[PDB]
Design a protein around this nucleic acid. Structure first.
Ligand SMILES: [Mg+2]
Ligand SMILES: [Mg+2]
Ligand SMILES: [Mg+2]
Ligand SMILES: [Mg+2]
Ligand SMILES: [Mg+2]
Ligand SMILES: [Mg+2]
Ligand SMILES: [Mg+2]
Ligand SMILES: [Mg+2]
Ligand SMILES: [Mg+2]
Ligand SMILES: [Mg+2]
Ligand SMILES: [Mg+2]
Ligand SMILES: [Mg+2]
Ligand SMILES: [Zn+2]
Ligand SMILES: [Zn+2]
Lengths: 177, 162, 38, 38, 71, 266, 42, 99, 40
RNA sequence: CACAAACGCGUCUCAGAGAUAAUUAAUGAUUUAAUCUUAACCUAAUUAACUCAUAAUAAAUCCAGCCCUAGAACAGGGCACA
């Protein structure tokens, strides 16, 4: 509380590095909280003119999940400017080409349409897998919780839980499976 | 449970039926007065694709659905569970309920894209290139409409198309 | 094939199957009864 | 300015649309489904 | 809590002439072009390359010489 | 101190050379046809530096090759320092060849025109004859307007350039500009003759670029000619390895030699 | 093993100096949360 | 004209800034802004958005106390709604009249 | 906000309505003598 | 073609992988038969596009003057053999 002016300023406006796991998580729900952190809407000292913005490192990008049939229905359209250079790539094809591109475009879309968008994007780091350089790993402060609870498979369930779950119906002995 | 066994012994084929022990229903259901299984066990409007322990009880080992005349569900819940089983199978749950093919498991393919709450088949939907404007918007359907009657603790309706 | 909006069976051997997101009236005895739902 | 009776369904004024949406029919829903109720 | 890391290493020390060894750690200098320098600054501070470019006389003259200060 | 020589693999690639384009010559084939060959003289090819695979591309390593010798008095300080540490006089054209990891050669190794054998397909990269700021008819081949039917100051104009509704011109619009001074590559050029004494390669067809220019020669990367490096010297041609002098002219099985019985049909 | 003061800084040395300054201020009683000066008529 | 329009819009802009700051400091305590505001009103604590933002920026402990009070009021209301009993009343849910 | 709760409790929809936040005198002299009354 | 060059009417070269829409069959339940499956599992025959292997550029701070097959100017390549 009783700090000098310069250290108090540094502590108040210090930058923070957050971690975000992207395995089995929806891009929209990941990148919404990502955009919140990049803007700095989680700081009571936030202001549009101030440069309050934190770094976010998103890992496990290749293992992303889309709700519904978005993998085959969602498209991304770009144009090279030249005539006949208008391309529309499906979400699955775009993910197979560049895993980072999906989350990158989601964050770019939900970031504000001002000139600060490029500045806050330059503070964003996205990695397809759990391969982060040590120089970045040494900066991480905390890891944000996953926005979606990953459901377990049948084999991931414990045997005691399986026996605890009741059998709703009784199959007949004469039937064949 | 019955099993068909075939024995080949010198140009002779023996086909025999074998009856094994089967698990039975739990002794104490919450609502014994209901004839129908789920809505006598008080699971109506409670299950989902996430609930694998309930979906896996009546399905063939190769992922197939089981006849209603054998299961006993009321028709709405039979359809709901058929949709939920399809959704779970497409999402990637139930890993051991797949046919075993020693030949096709060596030639690996592209990694399985993670998905959930998928309604249609992955190989039957064409990408939407026009996507529509604000007033006329072609939505991506998410989840089955048969699951709109599930209990909503938050109270907000489930967005089936987004 | 014939692309139609309303499909009907022209003989008792036609069968209706949902494939590739559409409906298909397929006939083996008379192949001209092959109809595809647009 | 269109006539009182037309063929193009005569897209309706917003407050009348809201009135129709409010006054849409709501069927009576029982507490327990009587199919496999006793 | 974790202990404070301390990094103290002087690899420029020479047993022959410590007078030259002392200047061996101070004679380090480098000069780059505008483009590479701005790129290095942007990469180091995690910003864009357009912030480091200078401004014209019209904007440099209109800056407040004595801005108000609180506290 | 030679680097270890690795055995040839089917997925391997070979280093190229940088020759000097002398001129054009005729060359007749045993079937009576006449081809035109271009003369590429390997004056001074030396491996300058070697860049590892992971530090260059991650798939294939890079070997840097120098061309014809130039003077020390007109090169920069850094280039002269590099050639001083290398031990060789400065080169004019310095190029990079993408090679596999098993065909790497120690820097400072010379290369000779016998690196290519008679009967092979090579790719030729060079800056074409720069015609400068040329008009649209000579640059893109557009047809002009009629010369004398009343046309006023329009005989060579490009005419319309875009469409009225667009209210702009597309980035792919063809218009007058620079023409010629750009690096082009000719693919699948057959080699008929290898002169060992003067280090000359006779490559079939035209070679992009004016005469007496530096030319980057490499193997053909076309899918039909992908695996012809098997019979060829894999690392490079070492004249000291065989301890046997090659013939002055290495000929193809179809080239009609200057010493020939004046072939007649039967 | 009892925290008496804490301080932020750009580098570790500056942070340690600031922590020492904060501990010194707390010991001497000159703190931002101290009693304001008494301006009254006794 | 722009000066007058922006003088009119300054109140709205600063109110939105205060609301954003109150949110930030609220989800920093794991509480949403609407729930925090309604449960602070239910406790008859009439602190406006400007003062709430001031407390959030300069009084972290006081703001955490306010967030804890608002949360506790929220579980009190939820328990009252679940119970549906006139007799059981929460401690902080009591209403005091004017005096 | 919170207007319906205040209306149910009996207070005004606006905290400025007839509440002690506005009806009471917001300042007084240090001696304790009453301040001049407010125009509102 | 009365310049050493330009030019055609003259000469050289022009490519591998994935991917799909319509449409065929294997296995298999709901609907223990069958049924290519907006049921899964791997499937195989498959248009044009479209991306990717591959190819080109890809050695920073000497530049007064003189040439150039390099060029509007600015730039770029040469000036040790002889
Ligand atoms: Mg009218
Ligand atoms: Mg020219
Ligand atoms: Mg003409
Ligand atoms: Mg005229
Ligand atoms: Mg004329
Ligand atoms: Mg005229
Ligand atoms: Mg326009
Ligand atoms: Mg006002
Ligand atoms: Mg069957
Ligand atoms: Mg059949
Ligand atoms: Mg490429
Ligand atoms: Mg130069
Ligand atoms: Zn039922
Ligand atoms: Zn038929």
């Amino acid at each position: 509380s009783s700090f000098s002016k310069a250290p108090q300023q540094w502590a108040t406006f210090a930058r923070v590095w957050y971690l975000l796991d992207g395995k089995m998580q929806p891009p929209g729900k990941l990148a919404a909280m990502a955009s919140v952190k990049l803007q700095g809407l989680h700081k009571p000292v936030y202001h549009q003119l101030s440069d309050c913005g934190d770094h976010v490192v998103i890992m496990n990008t290749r293992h992303i999940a889309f709700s519904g049939n978005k993998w085959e229905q969602k498209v991304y359209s770009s144009h090279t400017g030249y005539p006949g250079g208008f391309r529309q790539v499906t979400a699955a094809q775009l993910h197979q080409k560049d895993p980072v591109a999906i989350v990158k475009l989601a964050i770019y879309g939900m970031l504000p349409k001002n000139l600060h968008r490029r500045t806050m994007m330059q503070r964003l780091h996205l990695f397809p897998d759990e391969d982060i350089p040590e120089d970045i790993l040494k900066n991480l402060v905390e890891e944000l919780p996953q926005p979606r609870k990953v459901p377990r498979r049948l084999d991931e369930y414990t045997q005691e839980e399986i026996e605890a779950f009741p059998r709703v119906w009784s199959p007949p002995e004469d039937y064949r499976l | 449970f019955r099993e068909v066994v075939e024995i080949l012994d010198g140009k002779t084929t023996i086909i025999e039926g074998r009856i094994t022990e089967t698990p039975q229903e739990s002794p104490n259901p919450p609502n014994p007065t209901g004839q129908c299984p789920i809505c006598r066990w008080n699971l109506k409007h409670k299950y989902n694709y996430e609930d694998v322990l309930l979906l896996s009880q009546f399905i063939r080992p190769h992922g197939g659905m089981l006849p209603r005349r054998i299961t006993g569900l009321c028709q709405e819940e039979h359809l709901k569970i058929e949709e939920c089983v399809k959704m779970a199978h497409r999402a990637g749950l139930l890993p051991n309920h797949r046919p075993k093919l020693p030949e096709g498991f060596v030639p690996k393919s592209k990694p399985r894209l993670n998905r959930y709450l998928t309604r249609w088949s992955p190989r039957s939907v064409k990408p939407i290139y026009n996507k529509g404007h604000r007033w006329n918007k072609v939505r991506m359907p998410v989840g089955s409409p048969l699951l709109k009657d599930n209990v909503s603790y938050s109270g907000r309706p489930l967005l089936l198309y987004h | 094939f014939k692309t139609k909006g309303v499909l009907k069976k022209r003989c008792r051997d036609c069968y209706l199957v949902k494939r590739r997101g559409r409906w298909f009236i397929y006939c083996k005895t008379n192949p001209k009864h092959k109809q595809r739902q647009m | 300015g269109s006539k009182a009776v037309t063929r193009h369904r005569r897209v309706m004024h917003f407050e009348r649309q809201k009135l129709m949406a409010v006054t849409e029919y709501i069927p009576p829903k029982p507490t327990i489904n009587p199919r496999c109720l006793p | 809590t974790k202990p404070i890391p301390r990094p103290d290493p002087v690899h420029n020390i020479e047993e022959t002439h410590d007078l030259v060894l002392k200047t061996r750690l101070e004679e380090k200098g480098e000069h780059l072009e505008q483009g590479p320098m701005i790129e290095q600054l942007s990469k180091m501070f995690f910003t864009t390359k357009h912030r480091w470019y200078p401004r014209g006389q019209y904007h440099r003259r209109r800056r407040k010489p004595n801005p108000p200060k609180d506290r | 101190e030679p680097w270890p020589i690795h055995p040839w693999e089917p997925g391997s690639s070979r280093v190229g050379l940088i020759a000097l384009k002398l001129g054009m010559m005729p060359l007749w084939t045993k079937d009576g046809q006449k081809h035109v060959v271009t003369l590429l003289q390997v004056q001074d090819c030396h491996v300058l530096k070697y860049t590892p695979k992971e530090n260059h591309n991650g798939r294939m390593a890079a070997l840097t090759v120098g061309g014809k010798t130039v003077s020390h008095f007109h090169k920069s300080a850094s280039i002269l320092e590099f050639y001083q540490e290398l031990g060789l006089p400065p080169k004019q054209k310095v190029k990079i060849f993408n090679v596999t990891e098993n065909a790497v050669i120690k820097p400072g190794t010379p290369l000779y025109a016998a690196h290519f054998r008679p009967g092979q397909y090579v790719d030729v990269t060079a800056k074409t004859i720069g015609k400068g700021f040329q008009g649209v008819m000579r640059r893109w081949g557009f047809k002009g307007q009629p010369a004398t039917h009343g046309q006023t100051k329009t005989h060579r104009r490009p005419g319309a350039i875009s469409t009225g509704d667009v209210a702009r011109v597309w980035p792919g619009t063809k218009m007058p500009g620079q023409l010629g001074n750009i690096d082009r590559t000719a693919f699948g050029l057959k080699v008929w003759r290898i002169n060992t004494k003067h280090n000359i390669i006779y490559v079939n067809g035209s070679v992009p670029g004016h005469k007496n220019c530096l030319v980057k020669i490499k193997d053909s990367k076309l899918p039909a000619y992908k695996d012809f490096c098997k019979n060829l010297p894999f690392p490079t041609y070492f004249p000291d390895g065989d301890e046997e002098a090659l013939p002055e002219d290495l000929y193809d099985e179809n080239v009609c030699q200057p010493g020939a019985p004046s072939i007649t049909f039967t | 093993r009892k925290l008496i003061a804490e301080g932020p800084g750009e580098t570790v040395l500056v942070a340690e100096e600031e922590a020492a300054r904060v501990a010194l201020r707390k010991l001497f009683g000159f703190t931002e949360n101290r009693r304001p000066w008494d301006y009254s008529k006794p | 004209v722009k000066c007058t329009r922006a003088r009119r819009l300054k109140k709205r802009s600063l109110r939105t800034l205060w609301i954003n700051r109150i949110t930030a400091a609220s989800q920093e305590h794991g509480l949403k802004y609407p729930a925090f505001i309604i449960n602070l009103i239910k406790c008859q604590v009439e602190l406006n958005r400007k003062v709430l933002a001031d407390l959030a920026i300069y009084e972290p402990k006081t703001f955490k106390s306010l967030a804890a009070l608002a949360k506790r009021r929220r579980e009190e209301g939820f328990a009252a709604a679940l119970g549906d009993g006139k007799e059981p009343d929460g401690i902080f849910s009591r209403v005091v009249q004017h005096r | 906000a919170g207007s319906q709760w205040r209306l149910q409790q009996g207070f005004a929809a606006n905290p400025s309505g007839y509440g002690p936040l506005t009806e009471l005198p917001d300042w007084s002299y240090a001696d304790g003598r009453p301040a001049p009354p407010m125009k509102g």
